[PDB]
Amino acid sequence: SPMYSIITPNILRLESEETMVLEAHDAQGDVPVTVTVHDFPGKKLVLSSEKTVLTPATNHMGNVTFTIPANRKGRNKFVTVQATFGTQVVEKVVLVSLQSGYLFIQTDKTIYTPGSTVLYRIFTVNHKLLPVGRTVMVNIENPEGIPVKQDSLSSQNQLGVLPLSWDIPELVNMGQWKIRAYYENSPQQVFSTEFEVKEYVLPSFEVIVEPTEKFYYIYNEKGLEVTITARFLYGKKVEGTAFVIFGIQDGEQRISLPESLKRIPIEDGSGEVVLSRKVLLDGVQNPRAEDLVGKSLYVSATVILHSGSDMVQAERSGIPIVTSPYQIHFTKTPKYFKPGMPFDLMVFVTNPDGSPAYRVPVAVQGEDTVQSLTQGDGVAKLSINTHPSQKPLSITVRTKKQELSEAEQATRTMQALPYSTVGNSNNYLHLSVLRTELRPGETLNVNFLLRMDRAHEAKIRYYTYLIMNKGRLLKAGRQVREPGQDLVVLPLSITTDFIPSFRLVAYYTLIGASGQREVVADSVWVDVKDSCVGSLVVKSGQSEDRQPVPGQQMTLKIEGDHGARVVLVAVDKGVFVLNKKNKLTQSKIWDVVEKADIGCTPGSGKDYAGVFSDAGLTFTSSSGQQTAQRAELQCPQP
C-alpha cells in the first residue's frame, strides 16, 4: 500500500516563502496533489492553494512553495496545512510565528549631546537577510518610555534602507534613549537599539584597561595583574597619572574594594597595577576562597594628563574568578545516539570570557586512547564506538593541557540516550561527516550508513534528505541507494546560501518486520565559517606613504558586490572612548539569525518523530506516522 508523506517546517512565518515537500512512497503512476493552507480552528479562509503532480520520473518527489499572507492577542496562532494526494487527505496543524523578517538599526554615533542630530538608518530584510519592501513603524522614546517621534515609512524600491534623522531638543532628559522599530504586518516583533544622551566633550586620548590574563585564577598568589594603556587618538603615547580601583561583582551587585585603590604613573603610555590576593579576600569579608569562584572582577582606571587639561575614565569588567582556564560545553553535541554505530562528540571548549579556545586537547575519560584537539572555532570532534545496547551513554570529557596541572583542568559530563526504533526492529540510519571549519565553495561528503536487518535491506532504494538553513527549507532531494549499498556518499555543494550553519536531516521508509510501516530518520548540525554572503571592504585608494593632514583630499576605495547599495559613516574615535555600545556589526546580525532558528538540537531525536521536530520539521503520513505537535515558539530550556 502506498504511503503519502508531507514535510513542512515546525514554525511558519508571515510573508515568507515556506517550502513543503510531497512524497508518494511505493506507488506507480502519476499522483496529483492539491496543497491548501487554511486557518485554525476554522477552515473558512483559503490562505494558499497550489497544485503539482508527483510523476514516477522524479521518483514521486516534488515540492510546493506557498506564502502565508499577513492579514493579521497574547496566544499562539495556527494554520491547517492540507495536501490531498488524489483522494487521500494528509493534514497537519502547524504553529505560526508572527514575524515578517528582521530589522537592524544603525545610529551614526553611540552618544549624543542635547542639541545634536541623531542620524539613523533602518535595514529591512526578511528571514533570508535579503532586502524587502514593507511598511515599517519607527519610534524614538526617552528614558521615561514616552515616544517623542513616530514615523511610518515604505521601504519599497528603497533597497531595504530607510534613512532617518531627529534633532534632539536642548531641554531634554539624559540617559539611555531607545529607537524601536517593527513591521506593520508583524507588530509583535519589535527591534530596538540604544543611544546615550549626555553632556560631554570628546577626549583627546583613549585608555585601555587590559589584564594580563582574561580571567583570575583563584589560587594565583600574584593576584590580578592589570596593564593600563593610554595613547592619543592620533596614535601617540600619553604621559600622565592613573587612578586604578578594583571591585568584585556577584551577579548584578558590585562591591568596590577601597583598599585596592592605587595611583600609578603612566610613563610612555603604559602603567601597571596589581590587585593583590589579600586585598581581594579582605575586601570580600574574608571567606573561604572557593566562594569567590563564579564571581567576576572589574577594573576601573582614571587617567589624567600631567597638564590636567584632559582626563579619561575606562573600565574593564567581567573578569571571572575560575579554578580552571577552560569550560567544556556539549551544546553542539547530539544528545541521542544509535546503538552499534559510532557517536560523534562535538566538544566545545571556551575561555572563561566565552571566546573559543584554540589548540586545547580534550579526551574522553576512561577511553585514554581517544584524544583530539580544538580547532579555530573551539570545537574538537571525538568519535567513539558504542555497543549495540539500549543502555544510556554517560560521557565525561576532560582537557589534557600540558602546562596545566590536573586540578586546573576542565571537565564536563553529558548523557546520550539510545534512539528508539519502531517495534524494536534495530533498524537505524547514521549520518557521519567530518567536523572542521567548512567554507563556501567546498564539497561536503555526507555518509549515509544503514544498520538494519539483511532480510529487508533490498526494499530501501532511496534516502530523502532535507537541508534546513535559517529556519527554512533550502534544498530537499533524494539519495539513490542500490541493494547491498550499506553506505552511499552524497557530495553536497556548500554555497554561500549555507551561511552561518545548516541542518541535514534524512530518512528512509519501508514495510518491514510485521508488515508495519516503519520510518527511520537521522539529522546532523553542520557549522560553516561565518562571513558575509557577499563581501564589503573599505580601504585607502591612494598610496598613503604620507600621513594625511586636516583638510586633505583622500581617495577611499570601496570593494563589494555589483549593484549593492553601500551606506557610510565616519566617526571620531573619541566618541567610542565615551560610549562603544550598540554598534552594528556582522557578528550581531548572525546572533539574531541563530536565536531565531526553529531547530533546537544539534543531532537526532528519541525516535524518528523526534529527529524531524528537533531539526524544526513536521512529518505527517497517510499510514499514521507523524511527528508530535509543537505549540511553543521557543525551544525547550535545559
Next chain:
Amino acid sequence: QVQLVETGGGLVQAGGSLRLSCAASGSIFSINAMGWFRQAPGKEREFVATINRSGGRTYYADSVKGRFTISRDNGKNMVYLQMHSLKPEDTAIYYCAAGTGWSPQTDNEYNYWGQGTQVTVSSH
C-alpha cells in the same frame, strides 16, 4: 606629488637685473615653504630665499639680503625671484624647490625640486 619648472633665466650683464619664474605642477596652495636655491660652478648648493605660504614672511641669505625679492602667487601656482643689482659672484644654476615649512633656510626639508635654470652674470 608635484614637480617644478624654472624659467626666466639667461645671460645678463654685470649691473643689470632679471626675474626668474617658477611654474608648479599641482596647486601650490597649502604648501608652507617655497624656496629658491643656487649652486655656483665649483661651489656647493646654497640658500637664497624662502617665502611664507601666504607671502607675509620671508628669509634671505646675507649675501643677497638687500638685493633679491621673493614673491609668490598662490592663485597662479607661481613663485618668482626678482634679482636686482647683480654681482659676478651670483652666477649659478638657480633651483626652485617645494618645502614643508620646517627649517625653511636649509635644503633638508625640501622634497620636491625642479630642473634649474642658468643665470650667467658676466663681468663684461
Next chain:
Amino acid sequence: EDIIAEENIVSRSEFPESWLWNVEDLKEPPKNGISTKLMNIFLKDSITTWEILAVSMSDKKGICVADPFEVTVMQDFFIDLRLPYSVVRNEQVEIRAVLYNYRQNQELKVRVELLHNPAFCSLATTKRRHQQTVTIPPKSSLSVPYVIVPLKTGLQEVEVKAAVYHHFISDGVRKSLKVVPEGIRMNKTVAVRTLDPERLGREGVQKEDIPPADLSDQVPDTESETRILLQGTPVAQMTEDAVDAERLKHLIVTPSGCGEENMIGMTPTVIAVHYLDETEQWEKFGLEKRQGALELIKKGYTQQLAFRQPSSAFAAFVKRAPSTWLTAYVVKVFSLAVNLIAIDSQVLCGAVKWLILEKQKPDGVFQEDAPVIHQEMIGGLRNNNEKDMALTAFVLISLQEAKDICEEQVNSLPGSITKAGDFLEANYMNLQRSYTVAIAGYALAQMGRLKGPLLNKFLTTAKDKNRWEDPGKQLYNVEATSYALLALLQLKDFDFVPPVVRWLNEQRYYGGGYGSTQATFMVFQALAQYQKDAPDHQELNLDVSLQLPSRSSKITHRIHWESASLLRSEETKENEGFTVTAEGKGQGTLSVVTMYHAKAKDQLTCNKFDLKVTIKPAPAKNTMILEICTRYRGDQDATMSILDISMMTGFAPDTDDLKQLANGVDRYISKYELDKAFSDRNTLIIYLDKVSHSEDDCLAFKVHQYFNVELIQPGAVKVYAYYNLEESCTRFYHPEKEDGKLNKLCRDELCRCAEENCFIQKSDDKVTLEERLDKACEPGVDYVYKTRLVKVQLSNDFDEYIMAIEQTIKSGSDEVQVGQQRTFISPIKCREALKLEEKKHYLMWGLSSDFWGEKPNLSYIIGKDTWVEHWPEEDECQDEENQKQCQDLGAFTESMVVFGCPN
C-alpha cells in the same frame, strides 16, 4: 616688531563628531564579482582617528557590515583647544589651549594669541591683543591657560591662533561652547485635562483651550519647550470565564443507531467542536483531537441521510411517520454544523420546505404528531403544560438558524415566521411556565419584536434575577436559562447577562449523559455566542486634532483601540495658547508639561570642597607666596584628590619648594613635573592622598617672576576628587585684583567687560579748541557736561564718582537738570589714572553705550571713549599755565551752548 601671526591663519573650525553620512551605489563593472568604487572625500579639520563604517545591501547577497577602516589625521605642530561643554553666563573659567610639538629634536618658539570676542571678557580687548611667546621642548606639549568670562548666552565661539618663530608653520583652532544661564532646569505641569467627548462638551465634540506656560521663576530671555502628551486611557469590562475544556472531554461521541439514536451521538460532538472553535481552547485540549472529532461529525451527517425520507423529512425509521420536532431538530443541528463542515444545502432547505407545507397552520401553530420514539431528546418540551406554545417557539428558532442559508431556496419562509411570531405575542402574557417564557423569549427576540410588557414579563420571570426555573427536572431549567441567555445576547442587553452566566457556570453542567440532547446543545451554543459577542472594552475611538497658532497646520491622531499609537507626544518650542479639539467615544488623558530655566540660587559651584587661595608678596625680580588651603565637605575624609594649579602669566613655582612638597606623606608631585625646566612650566598638579573634612589642609610654595609682562592674567587652582571631575571647585588668584576676577561691571545677571582703557588718553596740551569741538560734535557723543565732584564712594569692585551736573553743555538721552547728581563708575585700576579730586570741576563727555541702570537710577560708566578733563576754577585761570586751557574751555562752552553742532 614682527607679529608672527601675520601668516594669515585661517583657523580650523570643522570638528564634527560624525560625518560622511553618504549613500554610494556600486555600479562599476565587476572584476571576479567585485565592483570597486573610488571615492574622493575631504577630511575634516580634526586631529584624531576617524573610524569609517560601511554597510552594504544587495538584492542577491543581502546585508553585509564591513570591518571598520581607520584614518589617522595628524600634524607635527597643532593646538588642541580643550573647551568644556557648557559655561555658566558671567562665571569666570579657565580654558586650556594645549600646543603639541611632535618634532623629534627641535625646540619650538611659538607666539600664541587669544583672539578678542565681544561675547567674552578677557585680557583681549578691541585695542589690545593677548599675545605671548612660549617654548615647547621636542616631543612634548605645553598648556596655555586663558581666563575668560562669557557675557551672553547661546553658542559662543573661542578662537586661538599660533605661529612658530623661524619656521613657516602656523595653526588656529576655532571651537564653540554653549553659554547657559545661571539658573537650574526645572519642569512644571501646565494642565491635566481628562478627555471625554460623550460626557463633556456639546454636540459630540470637546474643545479644551490650553493656557500658555504660567512660569514666574523663569530666567529672562531663555528658551522653554512645551510638551503635549495625548494618551488614550484604555478601559476594560469584566467577562465571565469560559468552561474548562478538561470538563468537556466526554462530549466526543461516535454517532450510531437509527434516525433518532444517530442524532443523540451527533449532538455532543457538533456542539463541542463549535464551542471549542469559538473559545479557541484547542491548545489546552489537544490540537490533534480536532480532526478526529471532525470525522465523527462527517460520520453523523453521513448516517443521518440514510434516515432522511424522500419527502425531505426525518423519522426514526424509513417506514416511520415524520416528526415536526425531529425534522426541526435536524435543521437546528445541521445549520450550526455548516460553519465547520458542509456537503449539501438542499437537505437543510428541503426540511424547511416540508416544515411549512405540512406542519404550518395559518394560525402560526406548530403541532406535533409525536413519532419521536426517544422522549429523551425532547428536553423541556416534554412534560410541559403549555406544550402548544413551547413547540411553536422551538420550530421557529430552527427556521432562523437556516434562514440565512435558505433565503432564496424557501421563499415562503418569512411568511411562516411572521405567522409564528403573531401566535406567540397573543398568548405570551398568559403563560405561567418559566420554560415557555424562556424559549419564546428567545423566539421573539430573534430578529423580531417583544413588546414592552413582553420584555418586562421575560425579565420578571427570572427568579432571583439570574435564572429561569420551574418545577420539573433540572435539565429543563438549564435548557431554559440557555434560551434566556441567547435572548439577552440577541437584544444586545448586557446588564442582565452577568448574573445569568454566573448561575450557568455555578450549575457546573458539562453536558453529556442520558436525556441530555437539548441541555448539551443549548448550554454550549449560548455560551459560545457569549464568547463571540462580548464587551471586553468600551470601544475607544477618539479623533483628537490640535489647532496650534504656532504653526499653519492641525495635527490629528485617531486613538483607536489599536495599540499602535496609544500615546503620542507633540513638542512645540513656541509657548503659545493652543486649542485641543477631541471628539469620539472613550476616555483619554492630556498632559502638558513645559521645561524651562528657573532662576534659583546659582550655588552649584564648589559643592564638595572649600578652597581658599591667597597670593602674598612675602620676601628673581618678583617673588610671591602662593598658599592653597582646601577642605572636603563630607562626613569623612575624602580619598585621593587633585590640585590643578595654574600659574599667573610670567610666573613659575620654586623647584626646591615642590621637591619638599613631593616628599610629604600625603602628597605626590610626579617625577615628570619635578624634572621640568624652570621656564615653560605654567601648570602643575599636586596629588593628595587625602584631604581632611575636619580642618583645612594647607600647602604653600613660592613663585618667581622669570618674565616681566605688562598684563598679568590671574592664575587658577582647581580641586576635585579622582572619581568626579564635575564636582570641582576653582578659585582664581591675582595681586591687585579682587579674588582673582577680571574687571567686570554687573547688574541683574548682565555684565560688561571693564578691561578696556580707563578714559581717552589725549593730553590737555596736545588738544586744541577745534579738536575738542570736532570730537564732541560727533553723533556718538551723547552727553557733554561740566560737572563738580561731590563725593568719592570708594569700593573694592569699582569706584563710584558722584558728580553734580554744573552745566548741561550738550543734553543727551538722559534728561538731567542742573544741580542734580549722576554717578560715574570706573574700575579700581583707574583710581590712580583718573586722579579725581572732590569739589573740583571737570569737562566730561561720553557715549550713550556707557549708560548703565534704568532711567530713574541711571549710572554712567567711565570707559575708553569717555573724556575726562580737569576744569580749573575762575581764579585758577589767572596763572599763565592755565591760560591756554581756560581759553579753550570757555570757548568750548560758548561754541556748543549758543551755536550747537553743525552736521
